Write an enzyme that holds these catalytic residues in place. Sequence first.
Site, PDB file in Angstrom:
ATOM      1  N   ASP A 221      -9.159  17.369   0.899  1.00 37.91           N
ATOM      2  CA  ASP A 221      -9.052  16.798   2.242  1.00 37.91           C
ATOM      3  C   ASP A 221      -7.581  16.755   2.657  1.00 37.91           C
ATOM      4  OD1 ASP A 221      -8.085  14.553   0.718  1.00 37.91           O
ATOM      5  OD2 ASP A 221      -8.665  13.252   2.396  1.00 37.91           O
TER       6      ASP A 221
ATOM      7  N   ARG B  48     -15.808   5.962   9.485  1.00 38.42           N
ATOM      8  CA  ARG B  48     -14.359   5.895   9.316  1.00 38.42           C
ATOM      9  C   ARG B  48     -13.712   6.439  10.583  1.00 38.42           C
ATOM     10  NH1 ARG B  48     -10.564   7.993   4.272  1.00 38.42           N
ATOM     11  NH2 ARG B  48     -11.533  10.025   4.734  1.00 38.42           N
TER      12      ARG B  48
ATOM     13  N   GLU C  68      -3.890   2.395   1.190  1.00 38.78           N
ATOM     14  CA  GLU C  68      -3.468   3.762   0.921  1.00 38.78           C
ATOM     15  C   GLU C  68      -2.083   4.033   1.492  1.00 38.78           C
ATOM     16  OE1 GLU C  68      -6.189   5.541   4.622  1.00 38.78           O
ATOM     17  OE2 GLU C  68      -6.309   6.398   2.621  1.00 38.78           O
TER      18      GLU C  68
ATOM     19  N   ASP D  42      -3.773   9.449  -0.335  1.00 36.10           N
ATOM     20  CA  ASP D  42      -2.830   9.068   0.714  1.00 36.10           C
ATOM     21  C   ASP D  42      -1.706   8.229   0.138  1.00 36.10           C
ATOM     22  OD1 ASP D  42      -5.111   9.093   3.401  1.00 36.10           O
ATOM     23  OD2 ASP D  42      -3.090   9.967   3.436  1.00 36.10           O
TER      24      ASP D  42
HETATM   25  O1  LIG Z   1      -7.396   8.972  -1.323  1.00 36.12           O
HETATM   26  C1  LIG Z   1      -7.452   8.753   0.024  1.00 36.12           C
HETATM   27  O2  LIG Z   1      -6.365   8.789   0.617  1.00 36.12           O
HETATM   28  C2  LIG Z   1      -8.697   9.129   0.753  1.00 36.12           C
HETATM   29  O3  LIG Z   1      -8.730   8.745   1.932  1.00 36.12           O
HETATM   30  C3  LIG Z   1      -9.387  10.379   0.273  1.00 36.12           C
HETATM   31  C4  LIG Z   1     -10.451  10.902   1.213  1.00 36.12           C
HETATM   32  O4  LIG Z   1     -10.477  10.511   2.376  1.00 36.12           O
HETATM   33  C5  LIG Z   1     -11.322  12.022   0.814  1.00 36.12           C
HETATM   34  C6  LIG Z   1     -10.989  12.851  -0.300  1.00 36.12           C
HETATM   35  C7  LIG Z   1     -11.833  13.878  -0.665  1.00 36.12           C
HETATM   36  C8  LIG Z   1     -13.033  14.125   0.065  1.00 36.12           C
HETATM   37  C9  LIG Z   1     -13.928  15.165  -0.286  1.00 36.12           C
HETATM   38  C10 LIG Z   1     -15.074  15.373   0.433  1.00 36.12           C
HETATM   39  C11 LIG Z   1     -15.392  14.555   1.551  1.00 36.12           C
HETATM   40  C12 LIG Z   1     -14.553  13.534   1.916  1.00 36.12           C
HETATM   41  C13 LIG Z   1     -13.358  13.305   1.176  1.00 36.12           C
HETATM   42  C14 LIG Z   1     -12.476  12.255   1.533  1.00 36.12           C
HETATM   43 MG   LIG Z   2      -6.869   8.449   2.803  1.00 33.51          MG
END
Ligand SMILES: O=C(O)/C(O)=C/C(=O)c1ccc2ccccc2c1
Ligand SMILES: [Mg+2]
Length: 715
Positions: free
Chosen positions: A622, A330, A423, A451
């Site tokens: 995050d 990513r 998102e 997001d």
């Molecule tokens: O819902 C979005 O906007 C999205 O991008 C969410 C994430 O990126 C996300 C959320 C929690 C995490 C927890 C541990 C490792 C990675 C992670 C990544």
């Molecule tokens: Mg995101």
Amino acid sequence: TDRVSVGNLRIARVLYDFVNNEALPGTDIDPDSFWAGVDKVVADLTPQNQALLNARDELQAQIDKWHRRRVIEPIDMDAYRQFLTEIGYLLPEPDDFTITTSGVDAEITTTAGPQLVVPVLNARFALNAANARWGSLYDALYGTDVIPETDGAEKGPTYNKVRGDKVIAYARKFLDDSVPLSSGSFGDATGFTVQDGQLVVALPDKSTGLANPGQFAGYTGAAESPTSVLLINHGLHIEILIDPESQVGTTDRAGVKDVILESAITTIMDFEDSVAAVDAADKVLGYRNWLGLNKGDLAAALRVLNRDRNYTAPGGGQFTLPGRSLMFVRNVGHLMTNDAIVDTDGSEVFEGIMDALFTGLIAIHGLKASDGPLINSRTGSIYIVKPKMHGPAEVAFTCELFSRVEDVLGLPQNTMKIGIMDEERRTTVNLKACIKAAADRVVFINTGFLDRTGDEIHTSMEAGPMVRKGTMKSQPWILAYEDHNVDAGLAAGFSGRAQVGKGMWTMTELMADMVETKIAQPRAGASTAWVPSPTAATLHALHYHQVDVAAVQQGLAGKRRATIEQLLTIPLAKELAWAPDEIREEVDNNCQSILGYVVRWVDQGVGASKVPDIHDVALMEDRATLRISSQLLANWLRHGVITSADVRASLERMAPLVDRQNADVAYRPMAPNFDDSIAFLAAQELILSGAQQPNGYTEPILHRRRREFKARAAE
Ligand SMILES: O=C(O)/C(O)=C/C(=O)c1ccc2ccccc2c1
Ligand SMILES: [Mg+2]
Ligand SMILES: [Mg+2]
């Protein structure tokens, strides 16, 4: 100073050296041609990148003012909708089409199953994540709360046979549910054999085979007394390990030692919201880990990547199965610049452009033999997730950027595939056009709901006060958004061609709840969804054995389950909706979440942290959850739900609780010298300046403040 001149670029030395000495060797790309490509791509594409960001601001300013000029009661949706169309926010929906993306691996086109996201800066985690393709169901059940610690089944320093027996029983029922015997139960099995290419299960009174013998996929050891039996269901493999000599197996009725599940089919190595990387040094650390993954030699004190797995076919021949999770990376989105490269005027270069060049270059190593076999894509693809795009033109720009990088790298056009995050609202309501913009590169869409919620708050910031954060999960807009995403994917031909993905389970200790709840995502037709750990990948794999996603997708086809009016339903709170104590709880809760995340972000450079909330639930936070929390409080402050005194009071009240929740050895307190704490002041600024941040993004403040902390720690 510390920089290398190449055309109009001044590259930080640590990056220049990393690329020449580590990333480039082995790719047959000429170092001088590569750096000339960087200079040229950056010069040619930076103007459109900046214009896209300006278009976001133009649109948001128009929406802000529209809401401020509204007199009439509840919003006139017909007027709102044609206004969004007038200003170019809502664009015409294109004619039906099917995607043409080719050369994509089966883990993406066909296999439904869990998708793991891991911070690329953490080498130990990234290694464990790549190895999470296979994982122990027994360990996942014993280690977590899926098996209650009730009736003498509590965990201790030493193995608990009462608990181990419940683990075994749980797994036996899973076998009955997934690979049924012709008659009888796996719980009553006493042995396994292969006779005439057929699996025979010994029961106390008789023998039996599978109700569907096609689910028998292979075995290890002698066909007459195998060391393991390999099953397949819904395209996912199940391995029963038979070892009567092991401790667990000595007590087992058929000598079974473990049940192994194919778990994280794919993994997303993350440079974005789960990591803190604010300069060239940070970027190089992650690039180097990504390089070790692709070359196959990443190692920590030693833990190494797994090799493929060997099996005997039911008929007696030999075959092999991928031992590693197929890797995505990513990249960051279109917003931020990074001083890893600056131009002759000192302006920082766009970080997304750099990620495409550098992660794309490094990914070439995964397409070729590791000093054994090729590490990643056997079909020739590079898999890049591109987050936070707003609308089709931003998708088209990402594809143009990949085309230019492919030229610089000497790769076939369309080698670089794109996983599209849905998102941001302007992508949601233009999703069909966004997919079409990437019709020959797209390998997934995914509802990044956290997001998306932040963008929902910021976009309608001027409309009025929003519902509390916990209420968002059930608001009309988000239910339409989730269904709208699946409909768009299936209608673009995603079944058999590209993943339809849903979002992350953040409550890492509530695995009973995850096993109960997260089945809704495959049941909604999603061929993948996000888990935060290898353990969570193994438990989420249960859902794909229960749910036949391919069937579900076939039944959803041609349906149109969300209207534009539902997608545009703004989560405004009704007046008088909250007592004072509910407002207080929401404020304290959001301030604690912000302070707990930001303090490890700014002080230690950790971008994803286990942070307990106001009800002591451990959340893996995050940056996107930070965007929600800060935008909500900024929205409540903006419309008079709370005062500036309330915010400051809450921050000061919650900061020593965070100070205490950390105590760890590297941690430094925020209380009581709040005006001296960069992390506290960052937290405050995310709230009090939240409404002025572009689309509510947190990186401008977080980066500035983390760089500030770095600069003070150095002197
Ligand atoms: O819902 C979005 O906007 C999205 O991008 C969410 C994430 O990126 C996300 C959320 C929690 C995490 C927890 C541990 C490792 C990675 C992670 C990544
Ligand atoms: Mg995101
Ligand atoms: Mg089935």
